[PDB]
Structures are given as C-alpha cells and as structure tokens.
Write a protein that binds this DNA or RNA. Structure first.
Ligand SMILES: [Mg+2]
Ligand SMILES: [Mg+2]
Ligand SMILES: [Mg+2]
Ligand SMILES: [Mg+2]
Ligand SMILES: [Mg+2]
Ligand SMILES: [Mg+2]
Ligand SMILES: [Mg+2]
Ligand SMILES: [Mg+2]
Ligand SMILES: [Mg+2]
Ligand SMILES: [Mg+2]
Ligand SMILES: [Mg+2]
Ligand SMILES: [Mg+2]
Ligand SMILES: [Mg+2]
Ligand SMILES: [Mg+2]
Ligand SMILES: [Mg+2]
Ligand SMILES: [Mg+2]
Ligand SMILES: [Mg+2]
Ligand SMILES: [Mg+2]
Ligand SMILES: [Mg+2]
Ligand SMILES: [Mg+2]
Ligand SMILES: [Mg+2]
Lengths: 260, 67, 131, 143, 188
RNA sequence: CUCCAAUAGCGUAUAUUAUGUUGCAGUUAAAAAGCUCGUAGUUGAACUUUGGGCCCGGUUGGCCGGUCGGAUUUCCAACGGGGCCUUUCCUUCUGGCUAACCUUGAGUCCUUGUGGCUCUUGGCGAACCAGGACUUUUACUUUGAAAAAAUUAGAGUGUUCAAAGCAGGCGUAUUGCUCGAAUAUAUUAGCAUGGAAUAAUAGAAUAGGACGUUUGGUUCUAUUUUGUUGG
RNA sequence: UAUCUGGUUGAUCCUGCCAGUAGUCAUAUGCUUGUCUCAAAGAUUAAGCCAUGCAUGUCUAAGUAUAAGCAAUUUAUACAGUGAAACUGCGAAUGGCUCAUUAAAUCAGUUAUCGUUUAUUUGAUAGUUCCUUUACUACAUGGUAUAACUGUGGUAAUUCUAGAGCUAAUACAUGCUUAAAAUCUCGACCCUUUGGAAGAGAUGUAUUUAUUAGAUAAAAAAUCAAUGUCUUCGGACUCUUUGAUGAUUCAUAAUAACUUUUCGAAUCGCAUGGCCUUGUGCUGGCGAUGGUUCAUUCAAAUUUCUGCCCUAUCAACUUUCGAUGGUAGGAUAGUGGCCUACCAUGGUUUCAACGGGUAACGGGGAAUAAGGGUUCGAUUCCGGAGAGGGAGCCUGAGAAACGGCUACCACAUCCAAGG
C-alpha cells in the first residue's frame, strides 16, 4: 500500500501453523526465501511451538545466533527463515535431523530422520531452459538452479539432490504407477499412486491418484509431487503413511488404543 | 451524495469548484429563503395592480366625456 | 486488534412471564431443589432445549447415515456420563424424554443432600458455598 | 478488412523483421510469416497465402491468444477491421425462482483473413489490449 | 502532470466518471524530446526501478545499416525529408522513428569500392583474388546506383531516439524505396 | 400497614418487531383501462430408438451364525449397475503399450463337474500414447476440485463449575513417555465431469448434397535420392 | 393474534365485537451497584477546530576515530579497549486512525501477463579490461574536496546559517593484472598453382539497430554451381547436431557495427598455515561487505468473465474540446486514444443506456427466523481510499508521501513590523 507489507496479523497466518489466538496480536511473517509465504514454516514456529525447545521468541534468537540450527546443510540465523517442504533441519547438539513433510491433516510433522538420509532432498523441477552461453538449467521447487542436468529430465520430474555437493544425483520421471505425495489443496498430505492424467490444453491438467486402500481422488497437477516407484519411496514417509482415515475409524482407533 | 450541503464551504473551495465542473458536463445534456420569492411575487402583483388601477381611472374619465 | 474471545449467554427468557402453570411449576422446582431465582431454571431449560432439538434433528436422518451415527453416539455418551440418562436406555430415542428434574438432580447441591451429609437442601448449599 | 490496394496508407506496411532480399530473384516475390494460433484453431488459407498486412491478426501478426474463449453472434460490422458481437445469457433471480434474459455486447477484432457478415456466429479468443475497448480476436467463423 | 490514466476518459457507453483517487506516480508521462539535428547532447532520465533512459536532443550521426549487403556504417544524418505521422516534423527537422532522412553515401561508397572494386557511378594481387572471387554479387540495383551518384541516400529511422539516445536506421531498398519515392515526389 | 413480580439488577419514553415466487384481492364496499389494432416482453399443438433376447454380478431381505458378540457359504425375493446380440458408427487413418485371448502347445489341484487356471509359433484397432484429420451449439441436472482465518454447527478435554481456551494426560515424578489442535457449511459466475427425459437450435429443394479402387487437368505446398547448399 | 382480565343489560347463559394484555434490540434517560472470570469504548451526514507532551530511528570482531573524551598497563611508535560528534549505509512507503468521495466504480469469486517493473531473500553466474598489446604505463595498490573539529561572525526569533583554516572512506572521481587453443579479416611472399604463404588485427559483458539459425509428413533420377572427406582424382555422398509451449519474431547462438562505455572487487575482521632456493621471496584458511545477468521470493501495475440500493412524471445519450475505430509517432516499467497528426463514422440504449437520490467504502459477517425472505454491517480479518480543501513534485526498489517539500484558497501561532 505504497510498498511491501511487513507485519502479519495473527488470524491472517497460515492455518497450519496452529498459532493460538489471544496470545498476541501479530504472527511471525516469513522473510523472502526459497518457499512461498503461505506454504512455509518459519524457524520460530518450528523451534518454539513444535519442539518446545524455546519458551520465548527471544530464546529462539539466542539459539539461532549460536550457529546451531542449519537448514539444508547451511547455517541460518534469520529467525523467520521460510523453511519448507522437503528441507532437512539439522540440529548438531541433540544429534537430530528433521525433515519437513506433511501429515494427512495438513500440518507439518515433526519427523526425525536418520543421518544418511539427511544428506539428500527431493526437488520437483519447475522449469528447464537454456541458460546463458548455451548452458541448460533446471529450476526446482525450492528456488534452486542447477546447471547441466541429464537431458531426459523434463518438467514435473522429481530430482534427488545431494545437499553437500549440491549436484543432482538421481531423478524420477512422471508416469502412471509412480508414487505421489500431494502437497496442496484439499487433499494435502495424501499418498497414492498415479492412475491417469488428463490433458486440457489451456489450463490445469488434472491427475487421478489412488491411495493404498483404493480411494481415488483428483487433484490439479500443480499440487502433485512424485516420490518414488510403486512400493518403494525415496524419502521416509511419516507415521500413518498418508492414509486419510475417516472420523469414525479414527475414534475407534483412539479408543481401542486405551493403553495405560 | 455528491452535491450535498457540507458543514462549512469556505474551507472546501477547491472541492466545490471541481463539483461545479462535474455538474456542468453531466447535465449539459439538458442545458444544451423562499420569503424572497414570496416577496418578489407580491411586489410584481402590486406593480401590475397599480398600473391597471391607473388605466381604469383614465378610461372612466374618458367615459365621463360621452355620457 | 487481537482476536475476539467469544462468549454467549447461557439462559433465555421463555415465551410469557405469567402462565399460571408455569409459575406453579417454577415454584415447585425452585422450592424442591433449593434454587435462587428464575435464571437457574431458565438456564437448565435452555440446556435441555438445545439437547433435545439437536437430537430431534438427528432423528430426521436415516439410520446408517454417518453424521447421525457419529453425533448420536457422541450425544448419548455425554448424557450417559453426566448421569442424566440411564445405562440401559441408550438409544437416541430416549433423549426426547428427559425432563428438567433429571438435570437438577445431578446438581452438586442436591447430590450432597442425597448423600445424607447435609440435613436439608439449603444447608447443603451453604456447606457448598462455604468451602 | 484491409481492402486490397494494401499500401493505402501514409506508411509502408510490412511484417516487422521480415526482409525480402533484392539480391536473390525467386518467384513467390514476398516472403511471408504466419504462426499457429494454438488450441486447435486453424490458420485459414487466406492468411497463409494472402497479401494483406495486419499487426493484430493472430495468424500473421503479433498478438497471441490466451485465456478465455468466447462465442457469440455478430451484431454489427460497421467499424474498420473490428466488429461487435453479442452474448446472451439467463440470469437466475432466486427469490422469484426464475430467470431473465440478459445480454452483453462485446467489441472484437476481426482479422481480414475472415469474411464476417451480420447475424453470423463466431468464436473469439482473448488477446492483450488491442485498443480502448477491444480485447478479443475472431479466431473461427462458423455459420 | 501528464498522466496515462484511462479513468479520466468517458466510458464506452458515453458515460462520465467521477474520479476516486488522486493521480499516481505509476501513471506518469514526461515531455516529448523533439530531437532536432546537430551537435550531440543527451539527457538521462531516471525511470522506474533505477533504469536509465537516454532522452536525446539534437543528435546528428547514426549507425545506418545496409541490409542487403549486410553491413552498417556510422554516417551523418543530413535532413528529414518525409515523415508519415505529421508533416510538421518535416518542416522543423525532428528525428522520430520512421522518419525518412538522407544520410551520407561516403562510408558506403568507400566500403563498396573496397569490397569489390567497382567505383559506383558511370593490384595487390590478393585483392584481385577476392574481388574476382565475388563478382557475381557486384550488382546493386538501378535506383540505389543513382542515389550514390547524387551523394546521399534515403534511409529510414528504426531506433526511437527519445528513448535510447541513438538514431540508428537502415537504408531503403526494394519496394519500400519505390513506395517512398512515389510518396515523397508526388507531394512535389 | 398487607400482598405481587423480577432480583445485583430494575424502571420510563421513542422506535421497531411476532407486498402475496411459495401466497393476496378486483358482481354486490379498496381495484378490469370505453373499444378494437398493435412493436418490445412473457408464452406457444403432436411427431424422430421403441421393444425384445442373452450373460455378468453388485446391495439388501429371508433360511441362515461355521464363532469364541458376525467371519461369512447354498437359494430365491426385490433394488439399483454393466456388457453383448437383436438392420443398431462404435469419428478415421499413422507404427506402437499390438487392447484381447477371435489367436494355440501341453497339462490338472478338487463335490461324478463348462462348479475351478500357469506358460506361446499369422495375430485384434480402436490401450489411448502422440500424431494427424475433423467434429452443430446451448439450457437443465449429478459428481469433483474451488470459495483465507475468525464467526456459525460440531468431536475431544473436570478452565474447581461456567462463559471460554486449545490445551493436555501418564510413569520408575532420581535427567521421560505419549494423544491432540478433527469434521461439515457456503447459493450465482468460471473450470472439470457422468446423464440425454424436458425446452430451444441447426443440416439435402434451383441439390451448389453425400460417400468413391473411378478417370480431365488446372494448380500450389517439399519429405526423400541424385556431392552439398541453391536453383 | 394468540393467551388472560374487563366492558357490552334488569339479570344469567351462549355467541360476536371492543379496550387493555407480549419478547423485542436500537437510541435517550432514571433509581440501584458487594465478590470472581472476561473485554469493550463511533456518531451534530461536524472528514468541524486543536494548547502541551509523546508516537522513528539505527553499530557489529567485520565502512571512516588524533574528541585537545574516557580507562589503561600489556608486545603493540601507523592504528589496535571503549567511544559522543559527524560522513557513509539502511529504514522512515510498514504500523496506527477514519469512512469524505466512489453505483460496473470499489469489492467478491475466477482468469491473464506470449504485455511489464521488482530493494531485499535464496540458488546460480564473470582467466578476455590500456596496446602495433616492446622501449612504459603506480598494481607492494593512484587523485581531490568536504563534514564534524578550530576560529571570526550576523539576526528579536526557528532543528537559520555565512566567511577562513584542517583531515578521512565501501563518499566521490579514476584505473592495471592471466590459461591454452580455435576462429575469421587485411594480408608482405613466390610462383602461377587446382594455389599456398610469414605476420598483423578481433574475439568477455551490457546497450542500439539491421541480418541469419532455432528443422522435422514419406520415393529416386536427370540438371548445373562446385569438387568438399577419401581421393580408389573418376566420383559414392558414405556417418550427418538442434530445447520448450496449446501457441511466438521464445529461450539461446551467430554476423556487421554503434555507445558523452554499463559491469568484470584498489574494501574489511579474525586466523596464521605451508614452503624452501631464507627472500620481510613464493603461495594459503574461515568470514564480512559489494557486484553483472538469469531464476526464485516478498510485491506491484494492468487485466478476463459474472454479480449492486431507489428512480421512466429521467428516453434518447456520447461525437466542436477523443466520442467508437484504422495507420504512424511520442510518452511509459509495459499494453492502450494514454496523448499527437491524418483518415473513417462509428459506440451504448425499453434485456432501461444516459441523468438524478443515497443518513453508499465493498466483503467475510450480525439479527429475526418453520421456510421463502427482510433488515443491519464506521466497528478486532482482508481489499480500497484519505490525511483542512485543490494542484504540483523531490529523493528512493518502492510515494503523486502529508509525524516530506512547494505555491494557491480557509483557518491560525510568534514578532523588536523587517520577518
Ligand atoms: Mg497501511
Ligand atoms: Mg497458460
Ligand atoms: Mg409482440
Ligand atoms: Mg411442445
Ligand atoms: Mg475474596
Ligand atoms: Mg449516481
Ligand atoms: Mg445508473
Ligand atoms: Mg544474489
Ligand atoms: Mg570552508
Ligand atoms: Mg528475441
Ligand atoms: Mg501505438
Ligand atoms: Mg486526435
Ligand atoms: Mg450501506
Ligand atoms: Mg457516505
Ligand atoms: Mg465494513
Ligand atoms: Mg495516501
Ligand atoms: Mg480535522
Ligand atoms: Mg530507503
Ligand atoms: Mg499529499
Ligand atoms: Mg499527525
Ligand atoms: Mg503515516
């Protein structure tokens, strides 16, 4: 309104951060970074809220400035850094590595991974082009730009990136039978396989996913991420595996988990 | 409420000049105290009355001529 | 600027102040359970109105509708837990019974008196509100 | 329309950056560019072979078709190279529970590769602002 | 000042709109350059973003390009001789795009007689080797020949010189030359 | 002085609240124009694939209940669904998933078994890939995606109750384990989709029509092969 | 309009009528007012006027310290801890407040940018810079001209400033170093060939124009050009690379030039390693800051389709002075009558245009409700607009900004009457 805004009033935050109303008047507004605004998670909503390591939003800064937390191998200090889908948050002390994946309610899970898995991440290509001096590049979903890819890589192929070197290691095409994790819209977090794909020259090509209990559903392609072949996935899925239970079965599960 | 009555109009002069222009155009399509009205009307009735009374008197004299 | 802390009123005035059956009923209630004003009775009748209408609006479903099964088991479980409903009468139909005295019997004041440690109703209210 | 005697106006007309070369002497005598509008519409033969010059024609010009594709009947063709079409719909008044006829005129650009008269049904497609009120090119002519 | 807003204009039914906001910066428009001929000067405006524009005023040479032969030479613009939009810019010699100017002929003739050795009008044995190796292409046209005999060629401007400060152009050849000769001399 | 009502609340004034789509009234007490013609508007008769035959099984209901309170096997009852065949384009072609067993070489676990299936020697054009080549257009109606959060309904939860809040619970409480923050709504437009009743629309009357291994050329576009790029 | 009370006569019944009888939830007001949890604060259609205070500034090890500032005492004689002032940088364009204007306008859902700008953040990215590139030109590193400070002052007065003397930079202004090839152009040569030949020049990036490539639907000859690998000297053309989208004159590359020549690190902190020929020789670590272009992100600006209250006793309107369109230019970040010149006569309208009224900011939403509906929404979230009224504009990525400037209308403060 003459320039970019800078505050974000809580109640206009993303609904999936689970920020309680009546605790203050504003919400952490993510800086500009790799991931978009509505579909990121700042590090202060992750360190403070989720893991309960901090109590304030000041002790978060005194964690980040001791050079402790690193997103994707590189050590980050901007306390509202937009962490996002498929990142690898390493905390050196506590010996922990997390990856940010969804879960079938739409949130962002606290999903610890092992060490040797914490050294790659997946990136869905978003464009391929000839760069400059005739050098091809790919542009993945987290803003990366990788020169010299394998010429069989086209738009919507999922690439597997080695965090240290930064180079592409591996890739996965986009075809039926591929395992798909859905990051966007109403089915946010469900895992199925592809069954079909509709053409629509002109806009918004749809995709018929089917999960592992035979419940098909349709999403736009924009919201589809490919994470491996049938059976075998490449990342490690969170618990519950993307099934989308239904609430009567959810309560039968909870109640039958009556252990004390 | 474009042509309202604002509270103070000396302190809104640039505004009312702009509104005068707006009205000029939009209704050039057609252009192409009431006690002062009551006072003017009564005055003009009075003047008409007195001129007629004068005329009446001159003619009644001229009718005295031809009795 | 903050988010609003919501609220809503728990009682509501009935149709008419006088309708002598209503005055006689409220006198029987507020004298038998040892109450204070008419707002206690109207608050309980507001609760029971809400319960009984939402249960009615369930009965205009059909059995094996997921919405009816889910919220019917929810409502029945709550009314069993409070004690208002029985243990054997656990169909959705029986909550279209449940007159006000069923609620006003689970009240802590009467429950003190019934346990025989209070010697009256009003003495029970006074033992309660004096810690 | 463009009305052959193509060099009618006070400046020479040519497709920009299309250069026919006087130091070669072929017979087709004017090198000519035409694109493919996309979306399954066909470049008509009068664009591939014709000699008009239009800079807002989707097949031989510098617009592109994207976004909404509309249809409607032509209602007047009295402007130069543009026309006005007319779309009708039924709008639902929910109190009365009924409908009512409504309509919108729309000015669209007709490239001179088409021959369009009044009463004629047409399918148009959206291009960038062509003039003050024009945002649409005729892309196929049906009836 | 000079704005590019469309909300002061009558709506397409012929209506008349009441304005709902003041002028904005992102709708401006500055002054025309009206860039005459002679003794270079250029003033650089700061546009949106940073973003220089070099508003030229009184420019006098240009990089004119001979399209058919495939070259370009920096020659000296000598006067606007026809303008399609507005016959006033002829009278006052104002360089806009599509102005029809007369340039110089002398770099071009020098180059041509260097490239082929043909002396437009009427020994170092390597040079004989090249010139005889390209003598089929030693053929221009009837008309451009006559212009070279005169001393100055017609040329169109194809660079906006109020926007980039450079008045480049190209040399008329072909049917465009016949059209502009007919127009220019059927005025006269 | 005696009652009555509401009660940490109670009174008075002013307003306002409990036109007709559903759903009003017009001889005699609101209101049918003096009369006919008439453009916009609303509205408009019937008719075009009906009917049969075969197979497949869903989801109920009954006989059932094998079980340590439902896992389900034989039947017919209805209810929805699909595929063939009955003159029934089911868009045409391009080398391919050849779709599919119309294709075939041998074998059989098991109630006597058309009650039950592993591998392949010309194959099947529709598996829709991508590709061409084109196709009457709507209204309606189902289903999907969409329509921020808070608000509203609503699941869980002893804020001591409650209004609320989205917290919390449980242990070896001596260095630690765990459940949550569901769900629905949202009407018109746009997008995608099954349906083809109802209501419009349009094709062959000067046949300027349709298919065609036909045979006149007029033409133009340029794939390949003549070194190679031009002709 | 139910319920309840009463009146309708000489009474009593039964009908009927009449009067009184109800929550509203909005404004104004009265009497009362102890405890716990909670949280609100508009209004004269006056978007009328404002005393005083405050609300926007900022420093790390890491741009500039000789404060004639403070503390030392530890290796610090260029400096070295801390550190006012001032230069530089960044921010002040967010937030907060209000609802005056505004009736296809805003706004709501839905599109588009193959029609553009983008500080920052994140990921990539830069061996080419002067020269006939040898008689040198700082690269162990170039030049002024100011602040604060000192000093002399003006005026009643203000966050007013003049004149003289110093000195800095990531201020400002300049300006070097390096691979190896390959490539074309001009070519001294000699010896005539079917021609080859030393050398010299250009090669990064950005800008501006002209041109070329960016293919693809399946046969073979005859034809010359011309012999290009092999020459098996005849000729076989044998093997021939090329991304994306629905779609491009796209991405990208190439040729000829152009430019008041853009960028291609003279900057800063901690460490002190290897070397080995011991020279203050050669290399070398973790960071900070800056930089070109491309992409991303936070945004912006335009934009597609449908949707507004009362009014016909408002029926024709727009078009001189842009109204609808065509061509060319100018202007803009960019499309566009956005403006200019010329030309055409169009555009909307009983399916209600145009013109009035609005105690009209739009939406999420609130209330009554059996429903259909009807009313309310300045007011906790989003979108617009405004900062007494009108008009301009500066700096900046971003403003037509008002706790920025400039003039005018209206108010109004100080005065030594000049400001
Ligand atoms: Mg703001
Ligand atoms: Mg698109
Ligand atoms: Mg009629
Ligand atoms: Mg009919
Ligand atoms: Mg106390
Ligand atoms: Mg109006
Ligand atoms: Mg109107
Ligand atoms: Mg960068
Ligand atoms: Mg000085
Ligand atoms: Mg280009
Ligand atoms: Mg233009
Ligand atoms: Mg004009
Ligand atoms: Mg309103
Ligand atoms: Mg208003
Ligand atoms: Mg509002
Ligand atoms: Mg403003
Ligand atoms: Mg004021
Ligand atoms: Mg700034
Ligand atoms: Mg201002
Ligand atoms: Mg202020
Ligand atoms: Mg402000």
């Amino acid at each position: 309104a003459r320039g970019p805004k800078k505050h974000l009033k809580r109640l206009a935050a993303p609904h999936h951060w689970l920020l309680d109303k009546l605790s203050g008047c504003y919400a952490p507004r993510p800086s500009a970074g790799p991931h978009k605004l509505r579909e990121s998670l700042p590090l202060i909503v992750f360190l403070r809220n989720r893991l309960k390591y901090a109590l304030n939003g000041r002790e978060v800064k005194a964690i980040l400035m001791q050079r402790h937390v690193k997103v994707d191998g590189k050590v980050r200090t901007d306390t509202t850094y937009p962490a996002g889908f498929m990142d690898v948050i390493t905390l050196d002390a506590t010996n922990e590595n997390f990856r940010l994946v969804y879960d079938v309610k739409g949130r962002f899970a606290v999903h610890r991974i092992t060490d040797e898995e914490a050294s790659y991440k997946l990136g869905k290509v978003k464009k391929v082009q000839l760069g400059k001096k005739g050098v091809p590049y790919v542009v993945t979903h987290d803003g990366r730009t990788i020169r010299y890819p394998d010429p069989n890589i086209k738009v919507n192929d999922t690439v597997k990136i080695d965090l240290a070197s930064g180079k592409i290691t591996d890739f996965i095409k986009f075809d039926a039978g591929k395992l798909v994790y859905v990051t966007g819209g109403r089915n946010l977090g469900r895992i199925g396989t592809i069954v079909h794909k509709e053409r629509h020259d002109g806009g918004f090509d749809l995709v018929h996913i089917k999960d592992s209990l035979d419940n098909t559903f349709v999403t736009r392609l924009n919201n589809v991420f490919v994470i491996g072949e049938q059976g075998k996935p490449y990342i490690s899925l969170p618990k519950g595996k993307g099934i989308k239970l239904s609430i009567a079965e959810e309560r039968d599960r909870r109640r039958a988990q009556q252990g004390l | 409420g474009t042509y309202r009555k604002r509270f103070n109009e000396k302190a809104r002069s640039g505004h009312m000049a702009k509104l005068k222009e707006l009205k000029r155009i939009r209704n050039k399509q057609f252009t192409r105290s009431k006690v002062s009205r009551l006072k003017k009307k009564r005055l003009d009735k009075f003047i008409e009355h007195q001129l007629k009374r004068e005329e009446r008197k001159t003619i009644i004299g001229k009718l005295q001529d031809y009795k | 600027p903050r988010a609003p802390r919501t609220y809503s009123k728990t009682y509501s005035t009935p149709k008419r102040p006088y309708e002598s059956s209503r005055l006689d009923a409220e006198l029987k209630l507020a004298g038998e359970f040892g109450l204070k004003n008419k707002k206690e009775i109207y608050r309980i009748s507001f609760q029971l109105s809400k319960i009984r209408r939402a249960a009615r609006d369930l009965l205009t479903r059909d059995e094996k509708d997921p919405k009816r099964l889910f919220e019917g088991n929810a409502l029945i479980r709550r009314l069993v837990r409070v004690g208002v409903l029985s243990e054997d009468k656990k169909k959705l139909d029986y909550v279209l019974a449940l007159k006000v005295e069923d609620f006003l019997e689970r009240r802590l004041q009467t429950q003190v008196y019934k346990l025989g440690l209070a010697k009256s109703v009003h003495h029970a209210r006074v033992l309660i509100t004096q810690r | 329309s463009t009305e052959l005697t193509v060099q009618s106006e006070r400046a020479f007309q040519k497709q920009p950056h299309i250069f026919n070369n006087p130091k070669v002497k072929t017979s087709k005598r004017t090198k000519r560019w035409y694109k493919n509008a996309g979306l399954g519409f066909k470049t008509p033969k009068t664009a591939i072979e014709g000699s008009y010059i239009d800079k807002k024609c989707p097949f031989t010009g510098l617009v592109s078709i994207r976004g909404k594709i509309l249809t409607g009947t032509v209602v007047s063709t009295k402007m130069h190279r543009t026309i006005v079409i007319r779309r009708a719909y039924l709008h639902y008044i929910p109190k009365y529970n009924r409908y009512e006829k409504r309509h919108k005129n729309v000015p669209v650009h007709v490239s001179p590769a088409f021959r369009v008269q009044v009463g004629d049904i047409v399918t148009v497609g959206q291009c960038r602002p062509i003039s003050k009120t024009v945002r649409f090119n005729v892309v196929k002519v049906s009836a | 000042g000079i704005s590019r807003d469309s909300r002061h204009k009558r709506s397409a039914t012929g209506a008349k709109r009441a304005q709902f906001r003041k002028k904005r910066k992102f709708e401006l428009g500055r002054q025309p350059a009206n860039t005459k001929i002679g003794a270079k000067r250029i003033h650089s405006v700061r546009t949106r973003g940073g973003n220089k524009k070099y508003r030229a005023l009184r420019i006098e040479t240009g990089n004119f390009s001979w399209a058919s032969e495939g070259i370009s030479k920096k020659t000296r613009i000598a006067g606007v001789v026809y303008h399609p939009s507005n016959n006033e810019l002829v009278r006052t010699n104002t360089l806009t795009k599509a102005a029809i100017v007369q340039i110089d002929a002398t770099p071009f003739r020098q180059w041509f007689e260097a490239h082929y050795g043909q002396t437009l009008g009427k020994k170092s044995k390597n040079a004989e080797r090249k010139w005889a190796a390209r003598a089929a292409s030693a053929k221009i046209e009837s008309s451009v020949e006559s212009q070279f005999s005169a001393g100055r060629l017609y040329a169109c401007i194809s660079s906006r010189p109020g926007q980039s400060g450079r008045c480049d152009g190209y040399i008329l050849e072909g049917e465009e030359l016949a059209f502009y000769l007919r127009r220019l001399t059927a005025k006269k």
